[PDB]
Amino acid sequence: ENRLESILSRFDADWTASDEARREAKNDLFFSRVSQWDDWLSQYTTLQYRGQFDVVRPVVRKLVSEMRQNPIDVLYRPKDGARPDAADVLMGMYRTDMRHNTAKIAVNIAVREQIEAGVGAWRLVTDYEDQSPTSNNQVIRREPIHSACSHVIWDSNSKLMDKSDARHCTVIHSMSQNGWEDFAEKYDLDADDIPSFQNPNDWVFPWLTQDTIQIAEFYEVVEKKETAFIYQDPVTGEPVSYFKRDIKDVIDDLADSGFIKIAERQIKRRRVYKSIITCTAVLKDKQLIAGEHIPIVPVFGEWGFVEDKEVYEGVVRLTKDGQRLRNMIMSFNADIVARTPKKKPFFWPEQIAGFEHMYDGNDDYPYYLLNRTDENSGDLPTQPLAYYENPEVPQANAYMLEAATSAVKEVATLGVDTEAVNGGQVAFDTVNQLNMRADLETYVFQDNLATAMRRDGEIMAEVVDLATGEKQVLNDIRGRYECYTDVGPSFQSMKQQNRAEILELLGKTPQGTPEYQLLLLQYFTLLDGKGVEMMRDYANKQLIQMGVKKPETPEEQQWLVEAQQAKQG
Amino acid sequence: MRHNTAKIAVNIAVREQIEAGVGAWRLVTDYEDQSPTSNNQVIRREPIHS
Amino acid sequence: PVFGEWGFVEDKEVYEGVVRLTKDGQRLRNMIMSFNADIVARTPKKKPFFW
Amino acid sequence: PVFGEWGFVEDKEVYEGVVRLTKDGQRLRNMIMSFNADIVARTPKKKPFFW
Amino acid sequence: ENRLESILSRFDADWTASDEARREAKNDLFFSRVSQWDDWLSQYTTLQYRGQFDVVRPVVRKLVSEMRQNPIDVLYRPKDGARPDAADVLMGMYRTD
Amino acid sequence: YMLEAATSAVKEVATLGVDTEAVNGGQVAFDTVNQLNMRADLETYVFQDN
Amino acid sequence: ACSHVIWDSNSKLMDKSDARHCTVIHSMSQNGWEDFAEKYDLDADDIPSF
């Protein structure tokens, strides 16, 4: 039907999608409990003992500790056609705004939820930095998303793991009063409005958190096929460069008074839009956000479809059933030990009567006395043959305890292999690096928007390789995507990687000649010191006089001068 | 076949291969203006659940 | 299309993964297991009989 | 601030050290242990019954 | 609402935050007990024996001893652009205090 | 029974997945969450000499 | 620290870097309060609370 009421559209695409963020989410957030909160559920005040003797944690702890020692980040290799020095520019930028704690933390948060619940996710954001910005007075940042199973929801009928074929991805925020005030501050809103939403949490309510305050960011995407605008490069010839009309609106005047040229073409290109939403109404519609992808990568454990219903899980889910038995039986046994008569003798009051004194616990007497006779008969004090039987813990409890716990650690494994080989969680690391990739298709496709700012024109009486500075605040040619994305060990900085890259090149090479160059190059890369400086400089001079270095020329020019003499003496 | 989809689609298939016995994916094509494989077009491997 | 174990029988196509054979025994495991859980849950504890 | 195991649940912050999980079983140990001590302390020794 | 009474603002941001320094803090400081003070809780004068035969301590002791022999501090590397001798100045200062 | 059971149940979870001596500390995940704070100790220290 | 530094600014991460409060608490002896009121210059006869 036709009903372009915007909120009715957006809300009637969340509502429709939250019918899956039901069947699954219901389970998923429930695992973030048999591990995160407590292994018992839905009573919260009973009179009978309930112990918690889990065995799932240690497994989880193990798995985390493994993924936490194999960092895995992005790579960006060039491409089959492009020039070798294509990646370094981008990579340097990426490495730069992913150094901070947040970038690290956000991922760790995701993988933990990946392991426990089955999902996890983080978002990419941008904003301005005046001091120490990555590029163009701006910086990109990786932000955390807790409880991804119940906050990010995107049934766009998306049929794959990085949710790249999705078009929605509506996420939810819960925030404190002060947080809402500060939020209404940033995005400029009525702080006295107070928002609402499906409420990612739950209905159970035996706690002290009542400040709901949930607002919702709604992302959407459209492959628009926007338009044209080509030009000729005034610099050293080699003309023909293309630009987005949308992105150079107010600029073309200035763009013309510098190298105006002409031609047109229709280019297909995706655009994303973040809209703020409450149940009642929309507070910010169609606000255009940076890149050309929805800035939210999701990690998955075991994932797939069933009845055309999305499905996923972490390690924890299978264990739940047996683990509860363990806890129950265990608690039952505790009752058996606590409330239960101890072994003591049965007496007729009559036989003990007269000297119950002797049976209290004294080691004062040499023996025990018993009344023998009784008028009206000859008493039958058959020496006390009867004691109350000891507490025993039924065979069934014993059996079912051992059974359950075994049954648990049977599935508390992902096919884990020997130490140092074939991680018990390759399949988790891979499904993670898959998301690390979606973290570039998202990052790459977003410098070309914000950070931006690169170009490298080719062409004594000859030269080549010369950078640029562009014009105005944004100005990237449409010949962008020259590097494809790949994953590899995480490094703090480009220099870190280059250093490691050379160490690898060593050992895998003989003590021949090319060893020495690598060896020297290593010293060359070392950072400040008293020890390293002397050696780094020596290695430099060495490499320049080797002729292979080719002077950076801050002074190394003269280093070559006394080298040019060539056995001149 | 570098993109995630090409990878994912196969992994999806093999999992169903192991569990159920079958699995499958499809190849599709369409136009790409920026960064196309060739002739303003690109081929892609799509998933087929169940 | 990928196939695990595949072939024809009565001129009828046929195929299966690892899972199919396990189903029968695995259900028994679950049942017996559940039965036992009942045994532990609902069942009088050991106590004395008195007049 | 340093954290051991940390994360969010019902949009409620959550965290714990190694100690938390152990608490339940450790108390049982101490109790049963104490119970037994009583058994050894207060309890009639083996002696004969005589008229 | 508008109520720029400073203390009412600061106090009404602590009070609001101490509702989490509740559910969790309640537990957290309680562990600094089954280990730090004593493994029994909330009676403190009974007539019946209460032994303390823990096994948690040894684990904790072990964990501490491990982290105590892998010091871990700061580094301050320069940067992709900066000159190599960038860090030493700061580092020297950090190391110092 | 319940004594042996309890104490075992305790040392079951009195471990962070601890590995062999000299390799993979039974507390890498603790050391890391610490070095994370060691980093916040600079963003705090660097941004305070200035 | 579990009961002295408290900072729900709705801070959603581990180094609490996105926080804006972080109110900490001091417990101190009489002589400590006198010496504290000395440093930060305060009425030693006030006696605080929290």
CSV table of N, CA and C in Angstrom, one decimal, chain A residues 371-483:
chain,number,residue,atom,x,y,z
A,371,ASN,N,18.4,-49.3,82.7
A,371,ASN,CA,17.5,-49.9,83.7
A,371,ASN,C,17.1,-51.3,83.2
A,372,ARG,N,17.1,-52.2,84.1
A,372,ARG,CA,16.8,-53.6,83.8
A,372,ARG,C,15.4,-54.0,84.0
A,373,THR,N,14.9,-53.6,85.2
A,373,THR,CA,13.6,-54.1,85.7
A,373,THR,C,12.5,-53.0,85.6
A,374,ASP,N,11.3,-53.5,85.8
A,374,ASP,CA,10.1,-52.6,85.8
A,374,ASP,C,8.9,-53.4,86.4
A,375,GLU,N,8.4,-52.9,87.6
A,375,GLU,CA,7.2,-53.5,88.2
A,375,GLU,C,6.1,-53.5,87.1
A,376,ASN,N,5.4,-54.6,87.0
A,376,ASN,CA,4.5,-54.9,85.9
A,376,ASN,C,5.1,-55.6,84.7
A,377,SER,N,6.3,-56.1,84.9
A,377,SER,CA,7.0,-57.0,83.9
A,377,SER,C,8.5,-57.1,84.2
A,378,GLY,N,9.1,-57.9,83.3
A,378,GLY,CA,10.6,-57.9,83.3
A,378,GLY,C,11.1,-57.2,82.1
A,379,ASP,N,11.6,-56.0,82.3
A,379,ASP,CA,11.9,-55.1,81.2
A,379,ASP,C,12.7,-55.7,80.1
A,380,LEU,N,12.5,-55.3,78.9
A,380,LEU,CA,13.2,-55.9,77.7
A,380,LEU,C,14.2,-54.9,77.1
A,381,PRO,N,15.1,-54.4,78.0
A,381,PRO,CA,16.0,-53.4,77.4
A,381,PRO,C,17.1,-54.1,76.6
A,382,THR,N,16.7,-54.8,75.5
A,382,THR,CA,17.6,-55.3,74.6
A,382,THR,C,18.6,-54.3,74.2
A,383,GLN,N,19.8,-54.4,74.7
A,383,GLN,CA,20.9,-53.4,74.6
A,383,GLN,C,20.7,-52.6,73.2
A,384,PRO,N,20.6,-51.3,73.3
A,384,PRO,CA,20.3,-50.4,72.2
A,384,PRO,C,20.8,-50.8,70.9
A,385,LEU,N,20.0,-51.5,70.1
A,385,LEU,CA,20.5,-52.0,68.8
A,385,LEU,C,20.1,-51.1,67.7
A,386,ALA,N,19.5,-50.0,68.0
A,386,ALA,CA,18.9,-49.1,66.9
A,386,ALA,C,19.4,-47.7,66.9
A,387,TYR,N,20.1,-47.4,65.8
A,387,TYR,CA,20.5,-46.0,65.6
A,387,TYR,C,19.8,-45.4,64.3
A,388,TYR,N,19.7,-44.1,64.3
A,388,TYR,CA,19.1,-43.5,63.1
A,388,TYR,C,20.1,-43.5,62.0
A,389,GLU,N,19.7,-44.0,60.8
A,389,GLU,CA,20.7,-44.2,59.7
A,389,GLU,C,21.3,-43.0,59.2
A,390,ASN,N,22.6,-43.0,58.9
A,390,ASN,CA,23.3,-41.9,58.3
A,390,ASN,C,22.8,-41.4,57.0
A,391,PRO,N,22.9,-40.1,56.8
A,391,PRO,CA,22.6,-39.4,55.5
A,391,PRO,C,23.5,-40.0,54.4
A,392,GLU,N,23.0,-40.1,53.2
A,392,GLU,CA,23.6,-41.0,52.2
A,392,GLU,C,23.8,-40.4,50.8
A,393,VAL,N,23.1,-39.4,50.3
A,393,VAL,CA,23.2,-39.0,49.0
A,393,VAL,C,23.0,-40.1,48.0
A,394,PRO,N,21.7,-40.2,47.5
A,394,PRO,CA,21.2,-41.3,46.8
A,394,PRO,C,22.1,-41.7,45.6
A,395,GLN,N,22.1,-43.0,45.2
A,395,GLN,CA,22.9,-43.4,44.1
A,395,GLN,C,22.5,-42.6,42.8
A,396,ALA,N,21.2,-42.3,42.7
A,396,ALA,CA,20.7,-41.6,41.5
A,396,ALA,C,21.3,-40.2,41.5
A,397,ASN,N,21.3,-39.5,42.6
A,397,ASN,CA,22.0,-38.2,42.6
A,397,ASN,C,23.4,-38.3,42.2
A,398,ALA,N,24.1,-39.3,42.8
A,398,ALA,CA,25.5,-39.5,42.5
A,398,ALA,C,25.7,-39.7,41.0
A,399,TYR,N,24.9,-40.7,40.5
A,399,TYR,CA,25.1,-41.0,39.1
A,399,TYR,C,24.8,-39.8,38.2
A,400,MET,N,23.6,-39.2,38.4
A,400,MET,CA,23.2,-38.1,37.6
A,400,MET,C,24.1,-36.9,37.6
A,401,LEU,N,24.8,-36.7,38.8
A,401,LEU,CA,25.7,-35.6,38.9
A,401,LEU,C,26.9,-35.8,38.0
A,402,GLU,N,27.5,-37.0,38.1
A,402,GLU,CA,28.7,-37.3,37.3
A,402,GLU,C,28.2,-37.3,35.8
A,403,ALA,N,27.1,-37.9,35.6
A,403,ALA,CA,26.5,-37.9,34.2
A,403,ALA,C,26.4,-36.5,33.6
A,404,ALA,N,25.7,-35.7,34.3
A,404,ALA,CA,25.4,-34.3,33.8
A,404,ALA,C,26.7,-33.6,33.5
A,405,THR,N,27.6,-33.5,34.5
A,405,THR,CA,28.8,-32.8,34.3
A,405,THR,C,29.7,-33.3,33.2
A,406,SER,N,29.8,-34.6,33.0
A,406,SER,CA,30.4,-35.2,31.8
A,406,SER,C,29.7,-34.7,30.6
A,407,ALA,N,28.4,-34.9,30.5
A,407,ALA,CA,27.6,-34.4,29.4
A,407,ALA,C,27.9,-33.0,29.0
A,408,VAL,N,28.2,-32.2,30.0
A,408,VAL,CA,28.5,-30.8,29.8
A,408,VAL,C,29.8,-30.6,29.1
A,409,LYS,N,30.9,-31.1,29.7
A,409,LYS,CA,32.2,-30.9,29.1
A,409,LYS,C,32.4,-31.7,27.9
A,410,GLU,N,31.4,-32.6,27.5
A,410,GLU,CA,31.4,-33.2,26.2
A,410,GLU,C,31.2,-32.1,25.1
A,411,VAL,N,30.3,-31.2,25.4
A,411,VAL,CA,30.0,-30.1,24.4
A,411,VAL,C,30.6,-28.8,24.8
A,412,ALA,N,31.4,-28.8,25.9
A,412,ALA,CA,32.2,-27.6,26.2
A,412,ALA,C,33.5,-27.6,25.5
A,413,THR,N,33.4,-27.9,24.2
A,413,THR,CA,34.6,-28.0,23.3
A,413,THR,C,34.2,-27.7,21.9
A,414,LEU,N,35.0,-27.0,21.1
A,414,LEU,CA,34.8,-26.8,19.7
A,414,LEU,C,35.6,-27.7,18.8
A,415,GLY,N,36.0,-28.9,19.3
A,415,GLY,CA,36.9,-29.8,18.7
A,415,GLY,C,38.4,-29.3,18.9
A,416,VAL,N,38.6,-28.8,20.1
A,416,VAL,CA,39.9,-28.2,20.5
A,416,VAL,C,41.1,-29.2,20.3
A,417,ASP,N,42.1,-28.7,19.6
A,417,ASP,CA,43.3,-29.5,19.3
A,417,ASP,C,44.5,-29.3,20.3
A,418,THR,N,45.6,-29.9,20.0
A,418,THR,CA,46.8,-29.8,20.8
A,418,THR,C,47.2,-28.4,20.9
A,419,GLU,N,48.0,-28.1,21.9
A,419,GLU,CA,48.6,-26.8,22.2
A,419,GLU,C,49.4,-26.3,21.0
A,420,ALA,N,49.4,-25.0,20.7
A,420,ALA,CA,50.2,-24.4,19.7
A,420,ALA,C,49.9,-24.8,18.2
A,421,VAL,N,48.9,-25.6,18.1
A,421,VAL,CA,48.4,-26.0,16.7
A,421,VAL,C,46.9,-26.2,16.6
A,422,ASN,N,46.4,-25.7,15.5
A,422,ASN,CA,44.9,-25.8,15.2
A,422,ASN,C,44.1,-25.3,16.4
A,423,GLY,N,44.0,-24.0,16.6
A,423,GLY,CA,43.2,-23.5,17.7
A,423,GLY,C,41.9,-24.1,17.9
A,424,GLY,N,41.4,-24.4,19.1
A,424,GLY,CA,40.1,-24.9,19.4
A,424,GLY,C,39.0,-23.9,19.0
A,425,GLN,N,39.5,-22.9,18.3
A,425,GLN,CA,38.6,-21.8,17.9
A,425,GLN,C,39.1,-21.1,16.6
A,426,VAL,N,39.6,-21.8,15.7
A,426,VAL,CA,39.8,-21.3,14.4
A,426,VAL,C,38.5,-20.8,13.8
A,427,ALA,N,37.5,-21.6,13.9
A,427,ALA,CA,36.2,-21.3,13.2
A,427,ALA,C,35.6,-20.0,13.9
A,428,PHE,N,36.0,-19.7,15.1
A,428,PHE,CA,35.6,-18.5,15.7
A,428,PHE,C,36.5,-17.3,15.3
A,429,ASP,N,37.8,-17.5,15.2
A,429,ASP,CA,38.7,-16.5,14.7
A,429,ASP,C,38.4,-16.1,13.2
A,430,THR,N,38.0,-17.1,12.4
A,430,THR,CA,37.7,-16.8,11.0
A,430,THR,C,36.4,-16.0,10.9
A,431,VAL,N,35.3,-16.5,11.6
A,431,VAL,CA,34.1,-15.8,11.5
A,431,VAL,C,34.3,-14.4,12.1
A,432,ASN,N,35.4,-14.2,12.8
A,432,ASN,CA,35.8,-12.9,13.3
A,432,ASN,C,36.5,-12.0,12.3
A,433,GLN,N,37.5,-12.6,11.6
A,433,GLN,CA,38.3,-11.9,10.6
A,433,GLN,C,37.4,-11.6,9.5
A,434,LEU,N,36.3,-12.4,9.3
A,434,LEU,CA,35.3,-12.0,8.3
A,434,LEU,C,34.7,-10.7,8.6
A,435,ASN,N,34.5,-10.4,9.9
A,435,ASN,CA,33.9,-9.2,10.3
A,435,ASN,C,35.0,-8.1,10.3
A,436,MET,N,36.2,-8.5,10.6
A,436,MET,CA,37.4,-7.5,10.4
A,436,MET,C,37.4,-7.0,9.0
A,437,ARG,N,37.1,-7.9,8.1
A,437,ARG,CA,37.0,-7.4,6.7
A,437,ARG,C,35.9,-6.4,6.5
A,438,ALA,N,34.7,-6.8,6.9
A,438,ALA,CA,33.5,-5.8,6.8
A,438,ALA,C,33.9,-4.5,7.5
A,439,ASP,N,34.9,-4.6,8.3
A,439,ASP,CA,35.4,-3.4,9.0
A,439,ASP,C,36.2,-2.5,8.1
A,440,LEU,N,36.6,-3.0,6.9
A,440,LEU,CA,37.3,-2.2,6.0
A,440,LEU,C,36.4,-1.7,4.8
A,441,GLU,N,35.7,-2.6,4.2
A,441,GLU,CA,34.7,-2.3,3.2
A,441,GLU,C,33.9,-1.1,3.8
A,442,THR,N,34.0,-0.9,5.1
A,442,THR,CA,33.3,0.1,5.8
A,442,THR,C,34.2,1.3,6.1
A,443,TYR,N,35.5,1.0,6.4
A,443,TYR,CA,36.5,2.0,6.6
A,443,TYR,C,37.1,2.6,5.4
A,444,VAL,N,37.5,1.8,4.5
A,444,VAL,CA,38.0,2.2,3.2
A,444,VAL,C,37.0,3.2,2.5
A,445,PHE,N,35.7,2.6,2.4
A,445,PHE,CA,34.6,3.3,1.8
A,445,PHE,C,34.1,4.5,2.7
A,446,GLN,N,35.0,5.2,3.3
A,446,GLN,CA,34.7,6.2,4.3
A,446,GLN,C,35.8,7.2,4.5
A,447,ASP,N,37.0,6.9,4.0
A,447,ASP,CA,38.0,7.9,4.0
A,447,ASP,C,37.7,8.8,2.8
A,448,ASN,N,37.4,8.1,1.7
A,448,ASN,CA,37.0,8.8,0.5
A,448,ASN,C,35.9,9.8,0.7
A,449,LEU,N,35.4,9.8,1.9
A,449,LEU,CA,34.3,10.7,2.3
A,449,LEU,C,34.9,11.8,3.3
A,450,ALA,N,35.3,11.3,4.5
A,450,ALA,CA,35.7,12.2,5.5
A,450,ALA,C,37.2,12.4,5.5
A,451,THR,N,37.9,11.6,6.3
A,451,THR,CA,39.4,11.6,6.3
A,451,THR,C,40.0,12.0,5.0
A,452,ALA,N,39.8,11.2,4.0
A,452,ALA,CA,40.1,11.6,2.6
A,452,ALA,C,41.5,12.1,2.5
A,453,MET,N,41.8,12.9,1.4
A,453,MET,CA,43.0,13.6,1.3
A,453,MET,C,44.2,12.9,0.8
A,454,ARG,N,44.1,12.2,-0.4
A,454,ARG,CA,45.3,11.7,-1.0
A,454,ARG,C,45.2,11.6,-2.5
A,455,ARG,N,46.4,11.7,-3.1
A,455,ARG,CA,46.6,11.5,-4.6
A,455,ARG,C,48.1,11.5,-4.9
A,456,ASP,N,48.5,10.8,-5.9
A,456,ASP,CA,49.9,10.7,-6.2
A,456,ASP,C,50.2,10.7,-7.7
A,457,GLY,N,50.4,11.9,-8.3
A,457,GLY,CA,50.7,12.0,-9.7
A,457,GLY,C,52.1,11.7,-10.1
A,458,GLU,N,52.3,11.0,-11.2
A,458,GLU,CA,53.6,10.6,-11.6
A,458,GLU,C,54.5,11.7,-12.0
A,459,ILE,N,54.8,11.9,-13.3
A,459,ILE,CA,55.7,13.0,-13.7
A,459,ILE,C,54.9,14.3,-13.7
A,460,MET,N,69.6,17.2,-14.2
A,460,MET,CA,68.5,16.2,-14.4
A,460,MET,C,67.3,16.8,-15.3
A,461,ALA,N,66.5,16.0,-15.8
A,461,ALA,CA,65.4,16.4,-16.7
A,461,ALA,C,64.3,15.4,-16.7
A,462,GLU,N,64.0,14.8,-15.5
A,462,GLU,CA,62.9,13.8,-15.3
A,462,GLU,C,62.6,13.6,-13.9
A,463,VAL,N,61.4,13.2,-13.6
A,463,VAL,CA,60.9,13.0,-12.2
A,463,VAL,C,59.6,12.2,-12.2
A,464,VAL,N,59.3,11.7,-11.0
A,464,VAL,CA,58.0,11.0,-10.8
A,464,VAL,C,57.7,10.8,-9.3
A,465,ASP,N,56.5,10.4,-9.0
A,465,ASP,CA,56.0,10.2,-7.7
A,465,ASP,C,56.0,11.5,-6.9
A,466,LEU,N,54.8,12.2,-7.0
A,466,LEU,CA,54.7,13.5,-6.3
A,466,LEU,C,53.3,13.6,-5.7
A,467,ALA,N,53.2,13.8,-4.4
A,467,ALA,CA,51.9,13.9,-3.7
A,467,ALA,C,51.1,15.1,-4.1
A,468,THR,N,50.2,15.6,-3.1
A,468,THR,CA,49.4,16.7,-3.4
A,468,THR,C,48.7,17.2,-2.1
A,469,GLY,N,47.8,18.2,-2.3
A,469,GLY,CA,47.2,18.9,-1.2
A,469,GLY,C,45.7,19.2,-1.5
A,470,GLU,N,45.3,18.9,-2.7
A,470,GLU,CA,43.9,19.1,-3.1
A,470,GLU,C,43.5,20.5,-3.0
A,471,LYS,N,42.2,20.8,-3.1
A,471,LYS,CA,41.6,22.1,-2.9
A,471,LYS,C,40.4,22.0,-2.0
A,472,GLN,N,40.2,23.1,-1.2
A,472,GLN,CA,39.1,23.1,-0.2
A,472,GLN,C,39.1,21.9,0.7
A,473,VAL,N,38.0,21.8,1.5
A,473,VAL,CA,37.9,20.9,2.6
A,473,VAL,C,37.8,19.4,2.1
A,474,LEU,N,37.3,19.1,0.9
A,474,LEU,CA,37.2,17.8,0.4
A,474,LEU,C,37.4,17.7,-1.1
A,475,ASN,N,38.2,16.8,-1.6
A,475,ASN,CA,38.4,16.8,-3.0
A,475,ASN,C,39.2,15.5,-3.5
A,476,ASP,N,38.5,14.3,-3.4
A,476,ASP,CA,39.1,13.1,-3.8
A,476,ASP,C,38.6,12.6,-5.2
A,477,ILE,N,39.6,12.3,-6.0
A,477,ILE,CA,39.3,11.7,-7.3
A,477,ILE,C,38.4,10.4,-7.1
A,478,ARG,N,37.6,10.1,-8.1
A,478,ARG,CA,36.8,8.8,-8.0
A,478,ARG,C,37.6,7.6,-8.4
A,479,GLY,N,38.9,7.7,-8.7
A,479,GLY,CA,39.7,6.6,-8.9
A,479,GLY,C,40.3,6.1,-7.6
A,480,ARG,N,39.4,5.9,-6.6
A,480,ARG,CA,39.8,5.5,-5.2
A,480,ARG,C,40.2,4.1,-5.1
A,481,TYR,N,39.3,3.2,-4.8
A,481,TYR,CA,39.5,1.8,-4.4
A,481,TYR,C,40.6,1.1,-5.2
A,482,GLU,N,41.9,1.3,-4.7
A,482,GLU,CA,43.0,0.7,-5.4
A,482,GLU,C,43.6,-0.4,-4.5
A,483,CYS,N,43.2,-0.5,-3.3
A,483,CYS,CA,43.6,-1.5,-2.3
A,483,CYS,C,42.5,-2.4,-1.9
